[PDB]
CSV table of C-alpha atoms in Angstrom, one decimal:
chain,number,residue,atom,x,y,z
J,1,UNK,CA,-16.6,-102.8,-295.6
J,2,UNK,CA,-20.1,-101.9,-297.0
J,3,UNK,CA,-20.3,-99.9,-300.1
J,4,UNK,CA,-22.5,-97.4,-298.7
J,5,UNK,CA,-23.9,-96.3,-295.3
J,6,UNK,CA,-26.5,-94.5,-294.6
J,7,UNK,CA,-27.3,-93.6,-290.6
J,8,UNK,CA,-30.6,-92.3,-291.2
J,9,UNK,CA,-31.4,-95.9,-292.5
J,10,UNK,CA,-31.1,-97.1,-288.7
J,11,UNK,CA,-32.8,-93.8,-287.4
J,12,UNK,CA,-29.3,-92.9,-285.7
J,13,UNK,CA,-29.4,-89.2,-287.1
J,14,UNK,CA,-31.9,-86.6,-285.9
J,15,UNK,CA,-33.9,-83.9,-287.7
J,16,UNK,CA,-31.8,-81.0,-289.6
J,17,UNK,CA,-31.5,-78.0,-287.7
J,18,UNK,CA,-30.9,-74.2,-288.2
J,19,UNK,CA,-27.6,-72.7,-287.0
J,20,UNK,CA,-28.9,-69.0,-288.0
J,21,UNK,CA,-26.2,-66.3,-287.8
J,22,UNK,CA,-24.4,-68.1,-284.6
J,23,UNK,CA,-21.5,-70.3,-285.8
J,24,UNK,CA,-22.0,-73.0,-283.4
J,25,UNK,CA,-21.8,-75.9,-286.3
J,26,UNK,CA,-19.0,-77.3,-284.1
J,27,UNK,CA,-21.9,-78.0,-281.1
J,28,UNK,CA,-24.3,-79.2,-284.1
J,29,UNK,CA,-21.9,-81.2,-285.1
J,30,UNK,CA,-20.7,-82.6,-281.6
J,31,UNK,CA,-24.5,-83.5,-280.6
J,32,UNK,CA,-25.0,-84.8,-284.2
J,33,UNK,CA,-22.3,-87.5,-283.0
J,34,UNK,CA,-23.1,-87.9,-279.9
J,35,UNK,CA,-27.1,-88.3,-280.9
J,36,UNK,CA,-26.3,-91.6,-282.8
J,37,UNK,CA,-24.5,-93.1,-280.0
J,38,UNK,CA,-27.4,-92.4,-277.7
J,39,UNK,CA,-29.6,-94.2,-280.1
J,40,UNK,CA,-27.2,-96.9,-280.7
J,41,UNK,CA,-27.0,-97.8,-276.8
J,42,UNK,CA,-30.6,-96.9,-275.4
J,43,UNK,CA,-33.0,-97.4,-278.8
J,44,UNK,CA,-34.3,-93.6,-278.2
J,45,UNK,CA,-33.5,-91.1,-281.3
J,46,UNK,CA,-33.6,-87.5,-279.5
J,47,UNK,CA,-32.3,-84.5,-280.4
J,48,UNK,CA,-29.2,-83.0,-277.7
J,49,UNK,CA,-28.7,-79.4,-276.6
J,50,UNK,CA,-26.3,-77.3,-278.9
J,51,UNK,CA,-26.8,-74.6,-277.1
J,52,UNK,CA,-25.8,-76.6,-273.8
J,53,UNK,CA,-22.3,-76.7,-275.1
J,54,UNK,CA,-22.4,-72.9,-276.5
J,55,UNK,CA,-23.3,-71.4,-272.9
J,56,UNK,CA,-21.0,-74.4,-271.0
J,57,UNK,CA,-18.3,-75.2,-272.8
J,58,UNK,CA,-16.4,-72.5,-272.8
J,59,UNK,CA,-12.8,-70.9,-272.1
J,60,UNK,CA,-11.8,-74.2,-271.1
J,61,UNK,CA,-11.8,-76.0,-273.9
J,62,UNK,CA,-10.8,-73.4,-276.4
J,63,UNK,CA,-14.3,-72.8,-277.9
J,64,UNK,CA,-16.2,-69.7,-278.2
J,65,UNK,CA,-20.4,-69.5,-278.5
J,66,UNK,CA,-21.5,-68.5,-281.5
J,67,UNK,CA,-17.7,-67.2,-282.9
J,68,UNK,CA,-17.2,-71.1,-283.6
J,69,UNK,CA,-15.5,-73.8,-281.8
J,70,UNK,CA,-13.9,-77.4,-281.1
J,71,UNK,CA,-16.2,-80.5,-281.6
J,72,UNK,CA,-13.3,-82.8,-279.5
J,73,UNK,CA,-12.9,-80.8,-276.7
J,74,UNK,CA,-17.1,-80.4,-276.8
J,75,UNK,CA,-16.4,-84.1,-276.0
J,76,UNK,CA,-14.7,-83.8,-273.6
J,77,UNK,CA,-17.1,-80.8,-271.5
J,78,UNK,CA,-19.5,-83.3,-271.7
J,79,UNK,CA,-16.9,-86.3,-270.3
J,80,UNK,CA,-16.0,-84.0,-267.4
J,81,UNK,CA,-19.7,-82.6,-266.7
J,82,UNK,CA,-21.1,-86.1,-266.8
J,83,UNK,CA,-23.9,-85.1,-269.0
J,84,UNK,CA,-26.0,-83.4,-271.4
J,85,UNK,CA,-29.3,-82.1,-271.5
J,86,UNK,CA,-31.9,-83.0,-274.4
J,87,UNK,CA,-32.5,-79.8,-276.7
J,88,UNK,CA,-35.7,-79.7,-275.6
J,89,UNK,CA,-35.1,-79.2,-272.3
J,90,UNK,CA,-32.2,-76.5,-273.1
J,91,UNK,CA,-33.3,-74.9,-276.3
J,92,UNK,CA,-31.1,-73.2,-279.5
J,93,UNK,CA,-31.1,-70.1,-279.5
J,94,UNK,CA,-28.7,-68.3,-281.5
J,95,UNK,CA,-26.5,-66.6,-279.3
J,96,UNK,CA,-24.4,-66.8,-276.5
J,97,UNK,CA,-26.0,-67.5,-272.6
J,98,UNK,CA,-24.6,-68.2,-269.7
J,99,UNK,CA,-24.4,-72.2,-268.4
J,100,UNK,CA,-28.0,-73.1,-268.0
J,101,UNK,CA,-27.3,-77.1,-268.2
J,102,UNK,CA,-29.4,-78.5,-265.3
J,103,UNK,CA,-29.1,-82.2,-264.2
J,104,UNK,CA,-32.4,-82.9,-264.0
J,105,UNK,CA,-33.1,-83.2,-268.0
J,106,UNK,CA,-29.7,-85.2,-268.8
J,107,UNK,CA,-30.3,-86.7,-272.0
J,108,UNK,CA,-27.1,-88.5,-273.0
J,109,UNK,CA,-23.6,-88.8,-271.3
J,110,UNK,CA,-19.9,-89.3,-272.6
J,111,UNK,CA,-17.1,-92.3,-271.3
J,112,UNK,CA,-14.8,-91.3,-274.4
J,113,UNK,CA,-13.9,-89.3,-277.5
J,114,UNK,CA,-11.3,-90.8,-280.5
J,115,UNK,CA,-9.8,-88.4,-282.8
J,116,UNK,CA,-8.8,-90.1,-286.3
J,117,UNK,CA,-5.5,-89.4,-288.3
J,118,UNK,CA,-5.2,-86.5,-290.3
J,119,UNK,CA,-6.6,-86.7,-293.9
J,120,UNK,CA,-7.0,-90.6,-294.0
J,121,UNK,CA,-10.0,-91.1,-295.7
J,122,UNK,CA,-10.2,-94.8,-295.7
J,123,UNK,CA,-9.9,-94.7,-291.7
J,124,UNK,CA,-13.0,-92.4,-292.0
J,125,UNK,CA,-14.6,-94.7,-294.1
J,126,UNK,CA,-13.7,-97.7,-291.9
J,127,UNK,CA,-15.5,-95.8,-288.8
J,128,UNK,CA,-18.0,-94.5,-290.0
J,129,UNK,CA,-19.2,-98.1,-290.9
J,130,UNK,CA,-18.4,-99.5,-287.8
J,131,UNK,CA,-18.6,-96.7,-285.3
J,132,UNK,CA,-21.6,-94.3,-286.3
J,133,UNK,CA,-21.5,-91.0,-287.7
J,134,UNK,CA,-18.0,-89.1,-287.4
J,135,UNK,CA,-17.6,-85.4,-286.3
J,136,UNK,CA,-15.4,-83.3,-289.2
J,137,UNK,CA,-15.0,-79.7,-290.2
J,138,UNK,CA,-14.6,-78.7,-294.2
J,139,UNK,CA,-13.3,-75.9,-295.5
J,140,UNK,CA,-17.2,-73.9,-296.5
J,141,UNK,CA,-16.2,-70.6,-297.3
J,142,UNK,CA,-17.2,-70.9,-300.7
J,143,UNK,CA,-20.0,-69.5,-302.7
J,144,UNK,CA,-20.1,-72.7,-304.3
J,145,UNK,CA,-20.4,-74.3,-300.7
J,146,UNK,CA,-24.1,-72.4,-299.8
J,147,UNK,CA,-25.4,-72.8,-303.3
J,148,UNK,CA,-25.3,-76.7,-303.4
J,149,UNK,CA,-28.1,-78.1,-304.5
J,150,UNK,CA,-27.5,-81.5,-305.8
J,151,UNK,CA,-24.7,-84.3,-306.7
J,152,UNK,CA,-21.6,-85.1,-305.7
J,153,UNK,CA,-19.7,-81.7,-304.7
J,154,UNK,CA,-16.4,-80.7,-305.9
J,155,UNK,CA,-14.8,-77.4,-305.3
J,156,UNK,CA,-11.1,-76.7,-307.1
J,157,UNK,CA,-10.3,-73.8,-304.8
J,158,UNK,CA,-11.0,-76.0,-301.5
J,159,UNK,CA,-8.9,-76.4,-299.1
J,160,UNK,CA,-7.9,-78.5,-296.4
J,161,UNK,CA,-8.2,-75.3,-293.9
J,162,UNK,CA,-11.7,-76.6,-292.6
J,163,UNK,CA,-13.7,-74.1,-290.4
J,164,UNK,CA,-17.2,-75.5,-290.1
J,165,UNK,CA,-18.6,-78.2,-288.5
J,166,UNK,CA,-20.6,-81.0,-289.7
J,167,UNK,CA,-21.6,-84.3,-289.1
J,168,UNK,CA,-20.5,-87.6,-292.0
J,169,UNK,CA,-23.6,-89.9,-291.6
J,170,UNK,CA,-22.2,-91.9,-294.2
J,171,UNK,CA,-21.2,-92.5,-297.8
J,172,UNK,CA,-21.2,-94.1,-301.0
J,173,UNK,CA,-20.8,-93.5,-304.9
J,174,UNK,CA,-23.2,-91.8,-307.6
J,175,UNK,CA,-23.0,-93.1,-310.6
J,176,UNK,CA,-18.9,-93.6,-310.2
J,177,UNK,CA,-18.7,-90.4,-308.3
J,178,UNK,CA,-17.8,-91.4,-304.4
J,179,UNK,CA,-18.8,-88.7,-301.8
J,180,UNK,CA,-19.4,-88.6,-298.4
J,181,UNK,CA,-23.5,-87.9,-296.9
J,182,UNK,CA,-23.0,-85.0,-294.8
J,183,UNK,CA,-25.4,-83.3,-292.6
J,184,UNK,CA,-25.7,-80.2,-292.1
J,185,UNK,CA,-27.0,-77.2,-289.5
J,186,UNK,CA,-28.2,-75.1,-292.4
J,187,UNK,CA,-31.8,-75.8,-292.4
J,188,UNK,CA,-33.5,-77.5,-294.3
J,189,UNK,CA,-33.6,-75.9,-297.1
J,190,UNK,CA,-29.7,-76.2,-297.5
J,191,UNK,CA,-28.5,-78.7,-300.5
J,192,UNK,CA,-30.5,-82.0,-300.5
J,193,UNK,CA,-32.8,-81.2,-297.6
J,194,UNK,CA,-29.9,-79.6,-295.5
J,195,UNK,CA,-27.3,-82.7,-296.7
J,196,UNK,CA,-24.5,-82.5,-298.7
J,197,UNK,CA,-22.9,-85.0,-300.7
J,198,UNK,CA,-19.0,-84.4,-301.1
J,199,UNK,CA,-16.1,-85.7,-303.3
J,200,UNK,CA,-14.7,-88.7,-301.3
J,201,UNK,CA,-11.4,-90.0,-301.8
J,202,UNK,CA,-10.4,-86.9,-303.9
J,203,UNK,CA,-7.4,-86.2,-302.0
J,204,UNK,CA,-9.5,-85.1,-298.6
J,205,UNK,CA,-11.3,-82.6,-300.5
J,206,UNK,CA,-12.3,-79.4,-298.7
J,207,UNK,CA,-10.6,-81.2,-295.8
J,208,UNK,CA,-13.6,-83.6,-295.0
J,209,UNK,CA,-11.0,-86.1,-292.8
J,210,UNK,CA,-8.8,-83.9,-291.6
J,211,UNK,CA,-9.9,-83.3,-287.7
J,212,UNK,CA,-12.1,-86.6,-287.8
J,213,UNK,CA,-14.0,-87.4,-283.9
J,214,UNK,CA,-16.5,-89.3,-282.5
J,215,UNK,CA,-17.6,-90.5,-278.8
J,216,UNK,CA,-18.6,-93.2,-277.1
J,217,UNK,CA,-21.3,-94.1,-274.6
């Protein structure tokens, strides 16, 4: 519906954060989603334990720590669990712990997850208006990927083979070029103060909407 959407304009999206050397972007990614919900339903903007889901969801649902993993079925450990505790109260640290999630600093829960259809990138568009920010992978592994700095990106060699996790906070067009805002778990020094901005549109490009998700509180 709107031309362009930016989450951070409703304070739905939370402060960039550092992955490091774990490849856990598919828990930054899941929290990233789940954040905006919280926000959306109780008014509080707080940032939720990645690391939570590295130590607890595990074998399971298919993901493994820090060797990378399945924002959906993060979901869904959280559905099951009933809960999540706040990062604060369950810190990142890089590496792979045993379950340390502890009732007591629950931060956020999950009723439901929805998965969209495979490369549509006006159905992306659609929730991400209407919904909040959606969970997708892209295809990174490209030098071009971690040397970003600025405009709308565009990779001829991408592919729709995605294999890291990050969060669409919303969208728009520069100057003709449509993209989709992506955050990050880069840091901040990453691209436009650890966002993205990638070709929209372009034929799923780098495979931004091909395993769309996003829950519900």
């Amino acid at each position: 519906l709107p031309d362009s959407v930016d989450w951070r304009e409703k304070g739905c999206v939370t402060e960039v954060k550092y992955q490091g050397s774990c490849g856990a972007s598919w828990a930054f990614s899941a929290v990233g989603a789940l954040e905006a919900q919280l926000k959306l339903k109780t008014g509080k903007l707080v940032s939720l334990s990645a690391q939570n889901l590295v130590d607890c969801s595990t074998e399971k649902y298919g993901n493994k720590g820090c060797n990378g993993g399945f924002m959906t079925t993060a979901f869904q450990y959280i559905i099951d669990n009933k809960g999540i505790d706040s990062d604060a109260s369950y810190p990142y640290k890089a590496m792979d712990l045993k379950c340390q999630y502890d009732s007591k600093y629950r931060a956020a829960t999950c009723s439901k997850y929805t998965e969209l259809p495979y490369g549509r990138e006006d159905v992306l568009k659609e929730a991400v208006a209407n919904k909040g920010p959606v969970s997708v992978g892209v295809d990174a592994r490209h030098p071009s990927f971690f040397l970003y700095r600025s405009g709308v990106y565009y990779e001829p060699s991408c592919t729709q083979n995605v294999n890291h996790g990050v969060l669409v906070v919303g969208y728009g067009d520069l100057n003709g070029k449509e993209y989709w805002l992506v955050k990050n778990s880069w840091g901040h020094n990453f691209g436009e103060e650890g966002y993205i901005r990638m070709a929209r549109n372009k034929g799923n490009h780098c495979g931004i909407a091909s395993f769309p998700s996003y829950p519900e509180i």
